[PDB]
Design a protein around this ligand. Structure first.
Ligand SMILES: Cc1ccccc1NC(=O)[C@@H](Cc1ccccc1)NC(=O)c1ccccc1
Ligand SMILES: [Mg+2]
Ligand SMILES: [Zn+2]
Lengths: 81, 23, 224, 146, 620, 687, 224
DNA sequence: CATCCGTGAGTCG
């Protein structure tokens, strides 16, 4: 129980850290996924077989990281070390 | 007064009287 | 750009958003609009009470769980709307085992109780309880010593005001290239007597009247 | 020499603490210990034995007991060892990477020696990696997370 | 967040803006887009607002003495040419605003922004990796602002009064809403003790049990309390679910509250709660009535009375040296003692003469800032000055600054003052140099494994036995035991184990062992645990920042190095002693130790000390 | 920076240099205050940095003797009787004598009051000594100090630590559009400004025959004339504004040695490094937290803390191997809109206003006839536009810089202007800026109480006195007892007394506290100038008394009490602040640490020739240094990818920095970092 | 516990006039006068000089031959020039004076609907052979608006943009007489004080203050 | 335990 997280505090890092081994692991976890999304939008322009698009509804001009970091909170992704 | 020497504005000074020599 | 008015809700209270204000007018409108809702709105509350089995305050009333003190506090929280300015009187009597509420109160004509489910005092068996209430009309908040029959009359803190608690913050909105414009957010909690949205419309009409005095002189220049 | 390796590690840690304690600063013993630990990771060679260890050389307890694990199994004399306390400057110099030690202190001395012992550097350190531009083998650099 | 100047932003996100300029067709190519950013066409300002959207930037402040010297922030555009910094992180950067400059680095790679927002965000690193103590906490005006309203004033207006005579009980309100309407009219003081019924705050643990039987308090459940209205406003911040605190908010108090929330409540709660405290402090720091007047700085009453006494005690020592009965080394060493004692007595003179109203003392005693040694140097006396050698000077500075030091007084104080500034710049150099040595020495030390498995640990003396009786907490408890994990089950007199092995010691788990009566625990150490390369996780234990077990891959060596060097500036043993240790030099003092235990044979000579030891077990 | 800055510069006493010592060769003995410094070298004036102790200033009354030692004036005491005969003593000469401190009480004839007096003795030792042994006595109390130090009112109340800064900082002050003398002074302000030589003094007595903004002409008694030419809007060494304005009106009778025109930071011939502002000692909604400063918008609207700065920009036209650089209005691929502010020559026109990125002097150079791109050849065939052989080598306005073009200087080899070998035309364009005080600009008092401007509130947001007068500056209470510089507090009190005026009660006699007060001060006007000489001047007694003599305002109401405090109304809420606030007038200087200078940023820029790393310096448009200490910070965090990225593609990866730029403007992903060109140099340097 | 419509009295002095308003809510007079003080000091409309031009002068930092002041000091003197214009659109004044003698604001030639109120204001001491030909533009506006904004518009190189201080208000304060006698006689009496610039009347200033505020508080009364 | 030579001795600007 808390106040609605604003901006870059959202999603709440605590619930985010629950879904991962440690801080460090979440970083590569999120970043590599963001690297898929920006790939998908660039490849969709001229090539099929791109990585899966945004599993959640993209916010207006939302950064690829912010997207990935949200769908991590939705457990919609799989985690491999 | 303080420096009643050149033609300056009067700046009133709290002091013991200082007459040894001007700077 | 002319300024907007917005509202995020809750049953008893709500937040209002006023933007964009000219730079320096957030605070100019701030503390004045709060002191109005808390003070410049008339309602009805309790001025004084009387208890039958009380000749002094320290002893609790025969047959009642609560002390003399805690009963007063529950009573201050009672919400009432009287139709006549002049002071009326309502009685509340109940005996036997059980719990006394605000629905048990016998109100005069044109006098309404707005929270009949409010707990007041828990009576046990062989517990007798008769209370005479004195209802007045006023504004804001009035101390007890200013309201001091001398056969057991108790001076009560008068919370005439139908607005309970109001806070305000002044952020800055970015209009055009200017990041100077003030955005006024306002929190208002009212009794069960009047909706907050209505409390503002009355508090605001109140102030419009004051500044009329100034404007009457020339109505020179302004632009919206 | 009098109270043995473990006792000297708890000595430093509290003498260190007592100085910070005096000035109101509280560091958790933990951190001090990490440093002290690095000071005692080498022992000195008393007798050479069958080992190729030059006597009077400060060698890693890992290397010393793994070369004495290899020669014990070979049939030859194991080197006799005595624990030795190292200052952080000397210990930092005695690092496995000539890269790390050159960038530390006494660069010209580091080089002249490493160029003689034909020392190869296996680039597996924080300093070593920062220099060459490999991700540092720590945090989001270890293969586990990477 | 941080205030990144508009101009600063446009040049950092310059390729990012030329990207979205040619996107929304403001420019026809990448070459023109450049000419738009350089010409500062009005369009780019609306574009830049979108470009910096939740794209974190790195604020750094030299000299970087620990890892919190670089932090990440959500960048906010702001008119003007200066960088706007959040008040709380000042403690971390050690950055005042007498002109300090900070660096801003823009993380480009997806991983870089990731590492920033997650590892390096200011809202995650509230705690000191060195000590676990809160660094982003109320610091100056904040604590003074909070310390104001949470103070209980006796005869203040609106205070609770019992019933007697014809007038009932004065000072009992129905709700916080009422008490607020009271101080607005002007009847109630926010610092006066009153009784109020509260509906949205959990009562103390001791009173929730008495009033509910620990039935689980609920938002709506009423109860009565004896506090001040301001103390109530304070607890609305912690907020619900946290046990009400009825004390005055000294800094150490507030230090505890945050540290408790660090342990129990999640990170995003502590960040949000600590923001509520900052705003609260400043509003009330404004209305604290904390102000400095010449009036508020007073000279002690017995000023010349006390100083004359030690001047007579000194003239007696001077004449006792005039006859040659005192050695020259003893004369000064006694004169030092005379005047040292003198300055203490001047200090006592102030504290009792000074009201707790006094803003100079109101600032000192509140843990807001300042020492009383400053307040003494200000109003009482400067005292002893330091020789270029370092020895204290026989002659004292009798004048305070309020009175004005004499000419000869100012000259010698100036001598001492400068030598301080010089040394201060020398130790800082010797601090960083030591820091860099520690850094290289513990680089190959990373948390590599989750468990070394060795049952080896080291004893920690948690408690000290009391001669009268009872148990006394060891002074070293915090730094030596609190963050460790156990390597052996801790058992009391009974066969009952109190704390298992593989368990992180917390605040209650120490209290369990402290109440059990056990006074020694074995804990997993970095010294003991033996892994191939570096160390495991288990032994290190609780990363002082995270408040949880250290993550696998943490550069706990460098972090340790920083932790030791960062406060290196603040020393007198001293910093030389610190180096003398870490470098393991044959010490100056070179105190001898016993080679074998036994009976002592003191045979002192006036010319030389000799120590013989008869071995307890046979021996020579 | 200012006239004082220059003055103190000349009196600097530096150990550094050839025949002197190195900064690394200096031990801790050289640098601490030696006793023989007294009345010769200032113990307060010295740098803060690594140069501390090695650089000082010469004390006021000290002179140099032909053998190069430092002498100082002492009054002579025959036999307990003070003589007006003065003899200069060298350091060792003074050791053999016995000297009395200046402020020791003296008879109207010249004799001492007490037998045993305070005495300075050889080796820094002091002891009471009977007056029959007194040889000499100090000339002035303010004798140990330098000229700068002597300008800090209530110096004996500040810790040497901040008194030192307060000294060093006065020379850091910036000349404001016009200057106000300080309400509170020490008497040094006059003599300083004059001897500084940045004002205008009259040679011989006479009458002003003609006065202009340009020059002052004087008619001497002997008939001869001397005309003094005013220095107008000149660039200093540090780009400050040395502007001289005449004081005297036409036909005034002026005497020799009188200031007839003052210059930068000078009012009526007195050192004016700042303004007299209305101060409020109080915390205010956190915007003054940690020595930050809050300002009234009055100071921006009324140009109170506004200054003028001039930059001198330069460019030349040389002989190359492809021809010779020619300066011309004809610049390759440039609209007539960008050239709209140039003349026919190619120079900016005087009066024009310039932004950064704009052109000042249009210069073109012949480019090397190398084979143009096969992709650019084809692009010139389509549009049929022949390329020119002249690359634009213009002089553009550097980042940050902006202002009005207030002058053009041109030098042609053609017009026999003797240039160095190879140069043909050389242009210098001078641009001035009228810099209003902004957020981050560094203000300071004379007491080392520095700090940057945190916020500039509207004039109505400011806490104000009863009569509605909004304050100017709000200083934080917290940063005051800490620093031990309460002389700023005394300046505030005396400041307000000097603002409102005063009048002691003469009925029932002259009050006992004001019994030492010189007659002239028992009555004072609103806004009256005073002097508190160092180790003299007002005492805490007189000050407290004077606070009660505070004359009422125009509405007939006293505004501050005898505590020196006054009640304030929050300009935001309206409600009155609960407790009385210390209020007065403090003298604030504008220092040369302005954000318009200090702010800097760089995406991509120029690069190092050898190491292929970014250059350093705002002038070179260089990047920040992410150094060894800063690496450890990343490492401790465990942010390896950030750290790597920093020292690779963000620095000296030749192929990476270019390909990361493309990845950003294309909207693609950040590539993998290559090999650091610095490391490739190491291996070749080792080779 | 009383009701009385409030008053708005006046005690005058030529340049400044106190305004009295009673009876008001308890603890209200303070946050009510301030709401006017913030309206006055910032948002009262008026007129001032925006840009000027001088014969033979191309920029702010130079000297006119024969004049004692530089252009900077002349512009700095012109800041204190008190002007009222009726033309909503920009207008152009003029000043031309030669020979020995002092030039003032009385030597300004104000067009139709433009009046100077302080002709005795010193501007420049033109010595012998001194000639000064100036051209001032005067617009209407409110608050404070910086010079620098003029040059970007398209102004030719001759013009010299000047900072504008439109607000015709000088110094505003207030005091409150609150009767706190224990009775229903508790009220607040507000005494506002306004000093103007002899450009407009203290009343007219407060009049435009009221016209502005009334238009603002009126959105607090409109329904959703 | 004490000498002689060689190498350290904060950061940005
Ligand atoms: C002792 C010393 C060391 C370094 C610099 C100055 C001094 N001595 C003083 O400052 C003397 C005054 C003096 C100055 C110059 C030559 C001789 C003596 N002042 C004091 O010893 C002193 C001590 C306590 C109170 C007041 C003055
Ligand atoms: Mg600083
Ligand atoms: Zn382990």
């Amino acid at each position: 129980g808390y106040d609605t997280p604003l901006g870059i505090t959202n999603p709440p890092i605590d619930e985010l850290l629950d879904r991962v081994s440690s801080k460090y692991a979440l970083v590569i976890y999120a970043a590599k996924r963001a690297r898929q999304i920006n790939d998908y939008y660039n490849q969709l322009g001229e090539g099929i077989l791109e990585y899966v698009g945004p599993l959640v509804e993209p916010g207006l001009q939302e950064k690829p990281l912010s997207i990935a970091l949200r769908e991590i909170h939705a457990d919609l992704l799989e985690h491999t070390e | 007064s303080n420096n009643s020497v050149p033609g300056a504005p009067n700046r009133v000074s709290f002091a013991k009287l200082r007459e040894p020599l001007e700077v | 750009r002319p300024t907007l008015s917005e509202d995020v809700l809750t049953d008893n209270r709500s937040q209002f958003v006023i933007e964009p204000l000219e730079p320096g007018f957030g605070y100019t409108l701030g503390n004045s609009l709060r002191r109005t809702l808390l003070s410049s709105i008339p309602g009805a509350a309790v001025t004084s009470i009387r208890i039958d089995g009380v000749l002094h305050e320290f002893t609790t009333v025969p047959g009642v769980k609560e002390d003399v003190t805690e009963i007063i506090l529950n009573l201050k929280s009672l919400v009432v709307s009287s139709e006549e300015d002049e002071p009326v009187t309502m009685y509340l009597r109940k005996q036997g085992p059980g719990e006394v509420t605000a629905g048990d109160i016998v109100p005069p004509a044109g006098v309404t109780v707005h929270n009949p489910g409010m707990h007041i005092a828990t009576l046990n068996d062989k517990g007798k309880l008769e209370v005479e209430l004195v209802v007045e009309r006023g504004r804001g908040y009035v101390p007890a010593v200013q309201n001091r029959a001398e056969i057991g009359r108790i001076p009560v803190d008068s919370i005439y005001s139908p607005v309970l608690k109001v806070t305000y913050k002044v952020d800055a909105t970015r209009v055009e290239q200017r990041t100077d414009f003030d955005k006024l957010i306002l929190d208002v909690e009212t009794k069960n007597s009047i909706s907050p949205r209505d409390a503002l419309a009355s508090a605001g009409k109140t102030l419009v009247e004051l500044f009329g005095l100034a404007r009457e002189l020339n109505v020179e220049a302004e632009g919206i | 020499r009098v109270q043995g390796p473990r006792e000297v590690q708890i000595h430093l840690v509290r003498e260190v603490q007592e100085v910070y304690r005096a000035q109101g600063v509280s560091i958790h013993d933990k951190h001090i210990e990490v440093i002290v630990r690095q000071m005692l990771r080498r022992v000195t060679i008393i007798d050479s034995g069958s080992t190729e260890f030059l006597p009077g050389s400060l060698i890693d307890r890992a290397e010393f007991e793994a070369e004495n694990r290899r020669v014990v199994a070979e049939g030859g004399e194991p080197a006799a060892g005595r624990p030795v306390l190292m200052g952080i400057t000397k210990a930092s110099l005695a690092t496995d990477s000539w890269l790390s030690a050159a960038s530390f202190q006494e660069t010209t001395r580091v080089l002249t020696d490493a160029a003689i012992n034909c020392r190869s550097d296996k680039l597996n350190g924080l300093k070593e990696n920062v220099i060459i531009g490999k991700l540092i083998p720590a945090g989001t650099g270890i293969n586990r997370y990477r | 967040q941080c205030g990144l100047p508009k101009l600063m932003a446009l040049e950092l996100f310059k390729p990012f803006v030329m990207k979205r300029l040619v996107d929304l067709n403001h420019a026809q190519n990448i070459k023109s887009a450049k000419r738009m950013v350089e010409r500062q066409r009005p369009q780019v300002w609306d574009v830049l607002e979108e470009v910096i959207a939740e794209h974190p930037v790195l604020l750094n402040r030299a000299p970087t003495l620990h890892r919190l010297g670089i932090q990440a922030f959500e960048p906010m555009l702001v008119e003007g040419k200066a960088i706007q910094l959040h008040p709380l992180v000042c403690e971390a950067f050690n950055a005042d605003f007498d002109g300090d400059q900070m660096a801003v680095h823009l993380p480009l790679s997806a991983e870089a922004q990731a590492e920033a927002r997650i590892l390096m965000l200011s809202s995650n690193n509230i705690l000191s990796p060195a000590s676990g103590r809160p660094l982003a906490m109320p610091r100056l005006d904040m604590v003074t602002g909070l310390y104001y309203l949470t103070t209980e004033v006796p005869g203040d207006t609106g205070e609770y009064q019992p019933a007697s005579g014809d007038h009932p009980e004065t000072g009992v309100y129905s709700s916080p809403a009422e008490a607020i309407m009271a101080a607005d009219r002007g009847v109630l003081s926010v610092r006066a003790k009153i009784k109020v019924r509260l509906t949205q705050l959990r009562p103390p643990v001791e009173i929730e049990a008495e009033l509910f039987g620990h039935s689980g308090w609920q938002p709506g459940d009423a109860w009565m309390a004896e506090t001040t209205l301001g103390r109530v406003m304070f607890n609305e911040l912690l907020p619900l679910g946290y046990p009400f605190v009825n004390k005055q908010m000294h800094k150490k108090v507030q230090a505890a509250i945050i540290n408790d929330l660090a342990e129990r409540y999640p990170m995003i709660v502590v960040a949000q709660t600590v923001d509520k405290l900052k705003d609260a402090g400043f509003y009330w720091a404004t209305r604290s009535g904390v102000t400095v007047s010449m009036a508020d700085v007073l000279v002690p009453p017995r000023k010349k009375e006390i100083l004359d006494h030690y001047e007579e005690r000194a003239d007696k020592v001077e004449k006792q040296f005039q006859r040659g009965a005192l050695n020259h080394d003893e004369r000064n060493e006694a004169l030092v003692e005379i005047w040292k004692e003198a300055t203490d007595e001047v200090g006592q003179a102030l504290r009792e003469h000074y009201p707790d109203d006094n803003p100079i003392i109101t600032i000192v005693d509140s843990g807001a800032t300042g020492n009383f040694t400053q307040t003494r140097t200000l109003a009482g006396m400067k005292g002893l000055v330091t020789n270029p050698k370092g020895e204290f000077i026989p002659r004292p500075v009798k004048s305070s600054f309020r009175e004005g030091l004499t000419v000869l007084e100012y000259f010698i104080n100036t001598h001492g003052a400068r030598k301080g500034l010089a040394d201060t710049a020398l130790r800082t150099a010797d601090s960083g140099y030591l820091t860099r040595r520690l850094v290289d020495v513990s680089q190959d030390v990373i948390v590599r494994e989750h468990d070394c498995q060795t049952e080896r640990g080291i004893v920690v003396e948690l408690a000290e036995r009391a001669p009268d009786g009872t148990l006394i907490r060891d002074p070293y408890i915090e730094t030596s035991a609190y963050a460790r994990t156990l390597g052996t089950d801790a058992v009391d007199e009974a066969g009952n184990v109190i704390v298992e092995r593989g368990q992180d010691l917390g605040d209650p788990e120490i209290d369990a062992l402290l109440a059990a009566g056990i006074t020694q625990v074995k804990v997993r150490s970095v010294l003991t645990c033996a892994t191939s390369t570096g160390v495991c996780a288990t032994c290190y234990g609780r990363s002082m920042a995270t408040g949880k077990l250290v993550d696998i891959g943490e550069a706990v060596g460098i972090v340790a190095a920083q932790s030791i060097g960062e406060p290196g500036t603040q020393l007198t043993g001293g910093l030389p002693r610190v180096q003398e240790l870490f470098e393991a030099r044959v010490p100056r003092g070179k105190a001898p130790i016993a080679d074998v235990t036994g009976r002592v044979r003191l045979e002192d000579g006036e010319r030389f000390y000799k120590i013989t030891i008869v071995p307890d077990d046979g021996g020579e | 920076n200012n006239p004082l800055s220059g003055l103190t510069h000349k009196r600097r006493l530096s150990a550094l240099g050839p025949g002197g010592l190195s900064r690394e060769r200096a031990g801790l003995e050289v640098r601490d205050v030696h006793p023989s410094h007294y009345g010769r070298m200032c113990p307060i004036e010295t740098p803060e940095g690594p140069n501390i102790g090695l650089i000082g200033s010469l004390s006021v009354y000290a002179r140099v003797n032909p053998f190069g030692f430092i002498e100082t004036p002492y009054r002579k005491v025959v036999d307990g009787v003070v003589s007006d005969e003065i003899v200069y003593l060298t350091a060792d000469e003074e050791d053999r004598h016995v000297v009395a401190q200046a402020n020791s009480p003296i008879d109207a004839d010249g004799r001492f009051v007490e037998p045993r007096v305070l005495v300075r003795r050889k080796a820094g030792e002091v002891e009471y000594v009977p007056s029959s042994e007194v040889d000499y006595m100090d000339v002035s109390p303010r004798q140990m100090v330098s000229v700068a130090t002597a300008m800090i009112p209530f110096l004996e109340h500040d810790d040497a630590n901040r008194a030192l800064m307060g000294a060093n900082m006065q020379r850091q002050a910036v000349p404001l559009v016009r200057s106000e003398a300080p309400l509170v002074g020490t008497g040094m302000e006059l003599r300083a400004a004059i001897d500084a030589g940045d004002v205008v003094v009259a040679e011989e007595s006479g009458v002003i025959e003609e006065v202009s903004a340009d020059y002052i002409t004087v008619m001497h008694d002997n008939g001869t004339r001397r005309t003094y030419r005013m220095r107008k809007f000149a660039r200093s060494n540090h780009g400050t504004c040395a502007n001289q304005c005449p004081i005297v009106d036409a036909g005034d009778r002026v005497e020799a040695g009188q200031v007839i025109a003052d210059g930068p930071c000078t009012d009526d011939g007195e050192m004016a490094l700042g303004k007299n502002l209305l101060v409020a000692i109080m915390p205010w909604e956190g915007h003054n937290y940690e020595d930050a400063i809050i300002l009234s918008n009055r100071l921006v609207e009324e140009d109170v803390l506004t200054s003028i700065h001039i930059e001198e920009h330069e460019i030349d036209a040389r002989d190359t191997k492809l021809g010779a650089e020619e300066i011309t209005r004809d610049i390759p691929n440039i609209s007539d809109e960008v050239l709209a502010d140039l003349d026919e020559r190619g120079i900016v026109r005087i009066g024009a206003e310039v932004r950064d990125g704009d052109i000042l002097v249009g210069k073109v150079t012949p480019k090397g006839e190398t084979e143009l791109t096969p992709e650019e050849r084809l692009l010139r065939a389509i549009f049929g536009e022949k390329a020119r052989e002249v690359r634009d080598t213009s002089l553009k306005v550097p980042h940050g810089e902006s202002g009005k073009v207030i002058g053009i200087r041109v030098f042609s080899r053609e017009d026999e202007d003797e240039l160095p070998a190879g140069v043909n035309e050389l242009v210098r364009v001078y641009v001035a800026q009228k810099r209003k005080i902004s957020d981050g600009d560094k203000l300071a008092g004379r007491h080392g109480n520095k700090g940057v401007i945190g916020k500039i509130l509207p004039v109505e947001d400011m806490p104000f006195l009863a009569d509605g007068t909004p304050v100017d500056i709000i200083l934080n209470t917290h940063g005051v007892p800490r620093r031990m510089n309460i002389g700023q507090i005394l300046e505030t009190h005396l400041g307000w007394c000097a603002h409102s005026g005063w009048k002691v009660d003469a009925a029932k006699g002259v009050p006992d506290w004001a019994a030492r007060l010189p007659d002239e001060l028992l009555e004072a006007q609103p806004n009256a100038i005073v002097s508190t000489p160092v180790f003299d001047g007002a005492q805490e007694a007189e000050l407290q008394g004077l606070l009660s003599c505070t004359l009422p305002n125009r509405d007939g109401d006293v505004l501050v009490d005898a505590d020196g405090k006054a009640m304030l109304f929050d300009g935001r809420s309206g409600e009155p602040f609960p407790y009385p606030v210390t209020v007065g007038y403090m003298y604030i200087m504008k220092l040369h640490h302005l954000v318009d200078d200090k702010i800097h940023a760089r995406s991509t820029g120029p690069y190092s020739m050898i190491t292929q790393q970014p250059l350093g310096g705002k002038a070179q448009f260089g990047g920040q240094r992410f150094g060894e200490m800063e690496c450890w910070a990343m490492q401790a965090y465990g942010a390896a990818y950030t750290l790597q990225e920093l020292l690779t593609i963000k620095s000296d990866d030749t192929v990476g920095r270019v390909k990361v730029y493309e990845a950003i403007v294309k909207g693609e992903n950040i590539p993998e970092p290559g090999i650091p060109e610095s490391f490739k140099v190491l291996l070749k340097e080792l080779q």
